[PDB]
Amino acid sequence: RSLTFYPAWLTVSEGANATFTCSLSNWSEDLMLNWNRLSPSNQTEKQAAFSNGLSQPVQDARFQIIQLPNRHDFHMNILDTRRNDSGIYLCGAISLHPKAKIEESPGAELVVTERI
């Protein structure tokens, strides 16, 4: 299983939604999908998790994950972008059973420009 996270570099104006796609090579019900932000220092920061059919925001519900009818592709939406949303994002997949595994997409960049 490998994950892709595109578009690789996306720009929107402040106030507008931004949508990336997290694409898995296969999906199953026991997977945990994490939506992560990369820190200046390069640490991961959880924005939202998707498991048991539901996306759960960590602290801001502007970060939402929608599963596509496809089932293995997910929209990662940052609704109503702000300037401070700019940065590097990625999705990570977490297997628990029978073997703990973390799989991470490459990062994608979001640039949020001045409100139009």
Next chain:
Amino acid sequence: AFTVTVPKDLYVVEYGSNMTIECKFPVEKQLDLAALIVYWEMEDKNIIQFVHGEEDLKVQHSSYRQRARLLKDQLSLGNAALQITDVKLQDAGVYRCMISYGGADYKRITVKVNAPYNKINQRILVVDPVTSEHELTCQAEGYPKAEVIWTSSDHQVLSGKTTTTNSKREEKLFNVTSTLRINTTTNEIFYCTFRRLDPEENHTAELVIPEL
């Protein structure tokens, strides 16, 4: 929601040290061991997989058997503490801890390993016992790469030549050798200094020119 915390993203560790790297997670009064899963990893090598109260040695990467362990006793305080003994240059890189206890989250931890240019070997030989030209040599092993500054007994810089290769005894250890060829006298003092960064380190040996 469930998140993991890292007190520090970056550990700088001396070669041959013990190392404890930590990931914190929220825990109330009593810990539910049948729900907790702790997983430490580096470069896809599986270090720790702690499930149902026990470490699963079956899944562990062999070259960690006797040297890596999760500290069971720290888990009650929401601390996932991975301890590696006798840290070597191979042990540098990005580690990931995944904790699942309710929700799940993972963080990255960077280890960088030093090695000090502490053991400096030296050789003093006579090139021509007419001109009194001498060949001075300093060599040491360390990490990262060091340059050598030669200084006279009077604190002036002299032109030496440095060669830099990999070690054979350990691993990515730099082997740094410098030679000073100079005309000199009995009882004269020369200094060779190994200068390395990350963090800064200036280590000096002293060479005295012998008799007859």
